[PDB]
Design a protein around this nucleic acid. Structure first.
Ligand SMILES: [K+]
Ligand SMILES: [K+]
Ligand SMILES: [K+]
Ligand SMILES: [K+]
Ligand SMILES: [K+]
Ligand SMILES: [K+]
Ligand SMILES: [Mg+2]
Ligand SMILES: [Mg+2]
Ligand SMILES: [Mg+2]
Ligand SMILES: [Mg+2]
Ligand SMILES: [Mg+2]
Ligand SMILES: [Mg+2]
Ligand SMILES: [Mg+2]
Ligand SMILES: [Mg+2]
Ligand SMILES: [Mg+2]
Ligand SMILES: [Mg+2]
Ligand SMILES: [Mg+2]
Ligand SMILES: [Mg+2]
Ligand SMILES: [Mg+2]
Ligand SMILES: [Mg+2]
Ligand SMILES: [Mg+2]
Ligand SMILES: [Mg+2]
Ligand SMILES: [Mg+2]
Ligand SMILES: [Mg+2]
Ligand SMILES: [Mg+2]
Ligand SMILES: [Mg+2]
Ligand SMILES: [Mg+2]
Ligand SMILES: [Mg+2]
Ligand SMILES: [Mg+2]
Ligand SMILES: [Mg+2]
Lengths: 97, 238, 77, 124, 244
RNA sequence: AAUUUAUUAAUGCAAACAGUACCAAACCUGCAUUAAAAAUUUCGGUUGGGGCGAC
RNA sequence: CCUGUUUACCAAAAACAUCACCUCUAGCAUCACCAGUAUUAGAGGCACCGCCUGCCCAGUGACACAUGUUUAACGGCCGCGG
RNA sequence: CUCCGCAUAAGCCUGCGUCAGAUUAAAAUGAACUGACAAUUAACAGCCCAAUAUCUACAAUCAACCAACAAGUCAUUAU
RNA sequence: GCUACCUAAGAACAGCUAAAAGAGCACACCCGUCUAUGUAGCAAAAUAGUGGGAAGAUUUAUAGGUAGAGGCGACAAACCUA
RNA sequence: GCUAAACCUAGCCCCAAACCCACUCCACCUUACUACCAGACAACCUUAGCCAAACCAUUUACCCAAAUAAAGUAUAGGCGAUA
C-alpha cells in the first residue's frame, strides 16, 4: 500500500467546509510502501492435526501465506476469534476434569 | 481503420485463393514496414507443411504420387501437387522432383537406418548421419518452419538420447527430438540466388518500392564484426 | 500443426457475464424492461426465440444427420 | 458548393442513390433473385366503396337548420347509452354477475380479432 | 439572469419530484449521506491540535484526503479501498528540480474465497490490504457485512452484501437444504447484521438501478374504463334502492 | 549547452509464489541502476555599425 | 551509367532513385514483416558493367567482456638538416 | 471557321418552353432576370437472392503453332 | 473530393520500324525545356510556338485508408483544400 | 436645382421575483427526417499553456456553499515575484 504526503500545506477550511485545493497540492512524496515492511504472523486455531502442530484447538502464529493458502481453505484451521477460543476452551476444560 | 485480414479461410483447398496486399501497413493504417507496395496480383496456394498427415480414415505410412511441379509467386521455391488416396495437396518440391514420382511419408523409427531417397519424409531418428534435409519442425506435429527457401538444406550431425542435432543453413546447430519429421534432399530452384533483376522496374513487379533518398551517416553498428557462432538452440526439455 | 483462419477474422468471444449472475438468490436489474441498451445496467439473457411460423425467405434447414435420406455409407457421385 | 439547406431527394446522388430512395409510397411486395419483383395481393390496400344509390345525404346542408350546440362524445357517454340499459334490466331481473360481462359487450382481450383497438391493425 | 437555486443543488432537486420522489425513504437517506471513508493512502494526524515547533503555539490541524482514482476493473473485485494515485513529484525530492507526473498503482492478486452464507466460491481480484482486512473481521462474510459502502469501494462487494442480507431476512432454506441444523447455526452467527427484507433489497443499488426497479413495481396495464363505470353504476343503484 | 527520465527497454532488490540444509517459473506492483528515445529552457555587455581581437 | 524521380506557383540539374556490389541485424507463425522461414526478411552505404578498392583499431563508437575484435564503421594516413 | 460534335457517367437541380413585363444584354427583335402556366410517362438504368455442408491444380494474348514471367478477372454439387 | 503514399476492383494507349525491348519515329493522352506575350490577366501560374515521354518505375475514373508532439516522402526540409 | 438630409419606434441592457422542463397525424442513428428480419461496439483517467518573475528552470490569485470582522494577521515562498 502506497502511503504519500503533500509537499505543500493545505490551508484550513473550517468546521463544515471543504478545503480549497490547488495545482501545487497534487505534488506528493512517498512516505512508505507497506509491502516492504517486516511480515507478521497469523494467529489461528487448529481444528485438526498438522505436521507443525498435532494438538487440536492449539494456537499457532504461522505465516500469512501458510494459513491463507492451505489451512483456511481446507478448514484445518479456524480464525482465532474471541468466540472460537471459547468453543475450543470447553474441550480443553473437559480434558482437565 | 476498417482493415480486415484476407487470411480468413478455415478449410484447406488447392484452389488458388485471392489475397489483397498490405502496402506495409498494419491494422491501424499507418506504415509499419517501408519498401512494400504494388506489384503483380497474386493468388495464394495453400501449402501443407505437415508431410505426415494421414487421411481421416487412414493411419500409418502412406505414399503419394507427384502430379505437377509448378511455379509459386508467393515463395522462392517450387511447389508440387501430390495425390494420395482420395485427396490432393500442395507441398514444397525438392531439387529433383518430376511428374510421375512416388514419394513416401512415414513416421516409423526402425532399429536401423533407411536408405534415404530425395522427396521422402522420415523422422530424424530414421536417417543416417550427414543426410541433407529440409522442412524440419521444432517438435512433433508442429509443422515445418525451417529450411523452406529455394536451394536451402540442412544436415544431420548426430543422435543423442532420442535427440537429433540439426545444422541450419546459417551454420547454426539446433537440437530437437528424433520423432520430428523432415524431408530428404535440397529445396528446388538451386540457382535462385544467381538471378539478375536487370532493371529497377522488375523490382516494382515483385512489390518492392525504392529506398529513401535521405542520406544517413553510419554509426558503430557498421563495419565487419567477427563474433563466434552462437550456442546450440534446443527445443528439448529435460 | 498450422491451423487455417486467423483469430482476428473469427467471431469475437461474447462479453463476460456480469458478476451479479454468480450470486444466488439475487435477481439482476437489466435493461430488458427499457427495451434498449444502457451502459449502467446489467445485460439480460434472452431465451432462444423461434419465429413460430414458416417463411420461405428466412428458412433454416435442419442439421445434416436429421435429414431423412441420410446414410452412414457414403456414395461417390 | 453543395446545397446543404435543400431537401434531400431521390433525384440527387449517383445511380445507386437514386434507386434506393423513395417518395413515401408503401411497399406491396419484395424483390427476388434476378431483380424480379413479387407483388402480394394482401399487401395492396383494397378500397371498400359502398353503394351510393338512393342515398339522401348530400355534400352540403341547407342553411335552414338549428344551431345545435356541440357535445363531444366521451367514454362515459357511450357507456350509459349502450351498456347501462342492458345492465339495469338484468339487475332488476336479479341475474347479474361479473363473469357474464363478456355477454354484455365487454372484451377481455384484443387477440383473435380482425380489428384490434390497441395496437390497432387497420386503416382509417 | 440568475438561477433561483444554485447549480450544486440541482441533483437533490431531482429527488423531490418524479419517480425518484416515490422511492423508499431509507434508500434516499443512504444516498445523501457523505460519511468519510477510512484513510488508506495517507496517515491521519490523530488529534485536532498540535504545537508548531517553529513558534510553539497550539495550532489546529485538519485531515485532507488524497484523491483516489478507481478504474472500472476495481468494481469486479475487492481492492480494500485502494486505487491509483494520480499526482506529481519533484525529481530527487528537490523542490528546485522540475515536476513530473507520477502514478502509483496497487499490486493485484487473483485469489479464491468462500462465503458461508452463499455456499459458493468466487475468484476475485484483491490487494494485500483486502486480505488483511478479511483476517481482522475473521472471515469474508464479516468483512462484507461490517465494512460500509464508502470503504468497500466496489459494486461487486455491495452486491454480495445484498445477497447475504436477503438470506438473513428471508431465512432462505436453499442454504444447505439437506442440513437444517448446520443452516440454522450459520444464521445464528451473523444475527447482528439482520435487516428487514424490505430494506435489505435496496442495498448497493445505484440511482439508475433503483429507478428501473421502482418503475417495474409501478408498471401495470391501465384498468379499462368499462369496469370503473360498472362499479359506479352498481354502487349507485344500491344507494337509490335505499331511498325508495 | 543546462535540467530531467515522466515514457520505453534491460538488470537488480523487494513483493507474490513452492518444494526436497538448499530453494522456487514468469505476469503484475513498488523502489533503485543503466541505456534508448525524447522533453523544457537559454545562448552576456561595452564596441567611431556588427563580427574578430581586446576589455 | 542507362528508362525513371523532385522544389504544384522563379531551380528538371551534375541533385534523388536505379540494375550491381558490400556492411549490419534476426533461428521464428495466426492482424504488418507473413498466411513468409537465412538462396529469407528487415536497417543502411555506394551506384550497372570493366581494371581496382592500398596503410591505420592509438582516439570515438559498436560488439565481445579477460586479454580483445572491428574502418565497404565515425575518421586518419609526417618533419628537420646534409 | 470547325478548337469539334452526339451520347453515357459524374455533378448541378428547372437555369433562352408558352403567355406577360416597368426588368435586362452594347442593343426601348431577344432574354439566361421577374410573375404565371406547362413539363421528364420504361422496355434503358437503379433497387436483388432460403439454409447447411461441399466443390473449384492446368491464364490471357483471333488461342491454334510458338514463346514467356511479373504467374494471372469469371465454374459447383448434395439434401 | 487538392496533393503525397497505399488498398480494392476497373479503363485507355493510332499508325510505322523492329518484333526481343523500363527499344526508336510519331497521334490521342501525361509532363512543362526554351522564347515571346501576359503581370488587378482569359488565368491568385495562363496563352501561342518550340519541346520531353508516350506497352510502362506509364496515364487515368471510382470508393476506401494513414491527421498535426502527426502523417506521407525515388529528401526538394517536398506535399497534407490557392 | 439634383443627390441627399431629418424622425421614433422595433426591440435591447442591468436588476428583482420565480426553479426549470412537451404534444395533430406521418417521418427521422442506413446516405438522418428512409413503413417491414438473426443481433450481442459501448460511459468514467491529474488540464496545459500564455502570462508574472523585467530571461528562465521551483513558483505565479481563478466562486465552491454566511455579508461583516478577525486579516492581508498566523503561515507558505528561487523566504524572490507573489500566495
Ligand atoms: K564609423
Ligand atoms: K510535378
Ligand atoms: K529534363
Ligand atoms: K577502437
Ligand atoms: K443545374
Ligand atoms: K520573455
Ligand atoms: Mg516463386
Ligand atoms: Mg512475396
Ligand atoms: Mg538499398
Ligand atoms: Mg542514399
Ligand atoms: Mg547568461
Ligand atoms: Mg552588443
Ligand atoms: Mg568595429
Ligand atoms: Mg571575442
Ligand atoms: Mg547500357
Ligand atoms: Mg518551381
Ligand atoms: Mg521550370
Ligand atoms: Mg546520385
Ligand atoms: Mg579504403
Ligand atoms: Mg631533405
Ligand atoms: Mg430492366
Ligand atoms: Mg481527383
Ligand atoms: Mg491494387
Ligand atoms: Mg502503340
Ligand atoms: Mg519507350
Ligand atoms: Mg521515344
Ligand atoms: Mg512520387
Ligand atoms: Mg538536400
Ligand atoms: Mg536545404
Ligand atoms: Mg517572465
Amino acid at each position: 500500500t502506497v502511503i504519500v504526503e503533500r509537499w505543500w500545506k493545505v490551508p484550513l477550511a473550517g468546521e463544515g467546509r471543504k478545503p480549497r485545493l490547488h495545482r501545487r497540492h497534487r505534488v506528493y512524496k512517498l512516505v512508505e510502501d507497506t509491502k516492504h515492511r517486516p511480515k507478521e504472523n497469523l494467529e489461528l486455531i487448529l481444528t485438526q492435526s498438522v505436521e507443525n502442530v498435532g494438538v487440536r484447538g492449539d494456537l499457532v502464529s504461522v505465516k500469512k501465506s501458510l494459513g491463507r493458502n492451505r489451512l483456511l481453505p481446507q478448514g484445518l484451521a479456524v480464525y482465532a476469534s474471541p468466540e472460537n477460543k471459547k468453543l475450543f476452551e470447553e474441550e480443553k476444560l473437559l480434558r482437565q476434569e | 481503420a476498417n482493415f480486415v485480414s484476407w487470411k480468413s479461410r478455415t478449410k484447406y483447398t488447392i484452389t488458388p485463393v485471392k489475397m489483397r496486399k498490405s502496402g506495409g501497413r498494419d491494422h491501424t493504417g499507418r506504415i509499419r514496414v517501408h519498401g512494400i507496395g504494388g506489384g503483380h496480383k497474386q493468388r495464394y496456394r495453400m501449402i501443407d507443411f505437415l508431410r505426415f498427415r494421414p487421411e481421416e480414415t487412414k493411419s500409418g505410412p502412406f505414399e503419394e504420387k507427384v502430379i505437377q511441379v509448378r511455379y509459386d509467386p508467393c515463395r522462392s521455391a517450387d511447389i508440387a501437387l501430390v495425390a494420395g488416396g482420395s485427396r490432393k495437396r500442395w507441398i514444397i518440391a525438392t531439387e529433383n522432383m518430376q511428374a510421375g514420382d512416388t514419394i513416401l511419408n512415414s513416421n516409423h523409427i526402425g532399429r536401423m537406418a533407411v536408405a534415404a531417397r530425395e522427396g521422402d519424409a522420415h523422422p530424424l531418428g530414421a536417417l543416417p548421419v550427414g543426410t541433407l534435409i529440409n522442412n524440419v519442425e521444432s517438435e512433433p506435429g508442429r509443422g515445418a518452419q525451417y529450411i523452406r527457401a529455394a536451394g536451402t538444406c540442412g544436415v544431420l550431425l548426430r543422435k543423442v538420447n532420442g535427440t537429433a542435432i540439426i545444422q541450419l543453413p546459417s551454420k547454426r546447430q539446433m537440437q530437437v527430438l528424433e520423432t520430428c519429421v523432415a524431408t530428404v534432399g535440397r529445396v528446388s530452384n538451386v540457382d535462385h540466388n544467381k538471378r539478375v533483376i536487370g532493371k529497377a522496374g522488375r523490382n516494382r513487379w515483385l512489390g518492392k518500392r525504392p529506398n529513401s533518398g535521405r542520406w544517413h551517416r553510419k554509426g558503430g553498428w557498421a563495419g565487419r564484426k567477427i563474433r563466434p557462432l552462437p550456442p546450440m538452440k534446443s527445443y528439448v526439455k529435460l | 500443426a498450422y491451423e487455417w483462419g486467423v483469430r482476428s477474422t473469427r467471431k469475437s468471444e461474447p462479453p463476460p457475464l456480469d458478476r451479479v449472475y454468480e450470486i444466488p438468490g439475487l435477481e439482476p436489474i437489466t435493461f430488458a424492461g427499457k427495451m434498449h441498451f444502457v451502459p449502467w445496467l446489467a445485460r439480460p439473457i434472452f431465451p432462444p426465440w423461434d419465429r413460430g411460423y414458416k417463411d420461405p425467405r428466412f428458412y433454416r434447414s435442419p442439421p445434416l444427420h436429421e435429414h431423412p435420406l441420410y446414410k452412414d455409407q457414403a456414395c461417390y457421385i | 458548393g453543395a446545397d446543404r439547406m435543400s431537401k434531400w431527394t431521390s433525384k440527387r446522388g449517383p445511380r445507386s442513390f437514386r434507386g434506393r430512395k423513395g417518395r413515401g409510397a408503401k411497399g406491396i411486395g419484395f424483390l427476388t433473385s434476378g431483380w424480379r419483383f413479387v407483388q402480394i395481393k394482401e399487401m395492396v390496400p383494397e378500397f371498400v366503396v359502398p353503394d351510393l344509390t338512393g342515398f339522401k345525404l348530400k355534400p352540403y346542408v341547407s342553411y335552414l337548420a338549428p344551431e345545435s350546440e356541440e357535445t363531444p362524445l366521451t367514454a362515459a357517454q357511450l357507456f350509459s347509452e349502450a351498456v347501462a340499459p342492458a345492465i339495469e334490466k338484468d339487475f332488476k331481473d336479479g341475474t347479474f354477475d361479473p363473469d357474464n360481462l363478456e355477454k354484455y359487450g365487454f372484451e377481455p382481450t384484443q387477440e383473435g380479432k380482425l380489428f384490434q383497438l390497441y395496437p390497432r391493425n387497420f386503416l382509417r | 439572469p440568475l438561477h433561483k437555486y444554485p447549480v450544486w443543488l440541482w441533483k437533490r432537486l431531482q429527488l423531490r419530484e418524479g419517480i425518484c420522489s416515490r422511492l423508499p425513504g431509507h434508500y434516499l437517506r443512504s444516498l445523501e449521506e457523505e460519511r468519510t471513508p477510512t484513510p488508506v493512502h495517507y496517515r491521519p494526524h490523530g488529534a485536532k491540535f498540535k504545537i508548531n515547533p517553529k513558534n510553539g503555539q497550539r495550532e489546529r490541524v485538519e485531515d485532507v484526503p488524497i484523491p483516489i482514482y478507481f478504474p472500472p476493473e476495481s468494481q469486479r473485485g475487492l481492492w480494500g479501498g485502494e486505487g491509483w494515485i494520480l499526482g506529481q513529484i519533484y525529481a530527487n525530492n528537490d523542490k528546485l528540480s522540475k515536476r513530473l507526473k507520477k502514478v502509483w498503482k496497487p499490486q493485484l492478486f487473483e485469489r479464491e474465497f468462500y462465503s458461508e452464507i452463499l455456499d459458493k466460491k468466487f475468484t476475485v481480484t484483491v490487494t494485500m490490504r483486502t486480505l488483511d482486512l478479511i483476517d481482522e473481521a475473521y472471515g469474508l462474510d464479516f468483512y462484507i457485512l461490517k465494512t460500509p459502502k464508502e470503504d468497500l469501494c466496489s459494486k461487486f462487494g455491495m452486491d454480495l452484501k445484498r445477497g447475504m442480507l436477503l438470506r438473513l431476512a428471508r431465512q432462505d432454506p436453499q442454504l444447505h437444504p439437506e442440513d437444517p441444523e448446520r443452516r440454522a447455526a450459520i444464521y445464528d452467527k451473523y444475527k447482528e447484521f439482520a435487516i428487514p427484507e424490505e430494506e435489505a433489497e435496496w442495498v448497493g443499488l445505484t440511482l439508475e438501478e433503483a429507478i428501473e426497479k421502482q418503475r417495474l413495481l409501478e408498471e401495470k396495464d391501465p384498468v379499462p374504463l368499462f369496469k370503473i363505470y360498472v362499479a359506479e353504476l352498481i354502487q349507485q343503484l344500491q344507494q337509490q334502492a335505499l331511498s325508495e
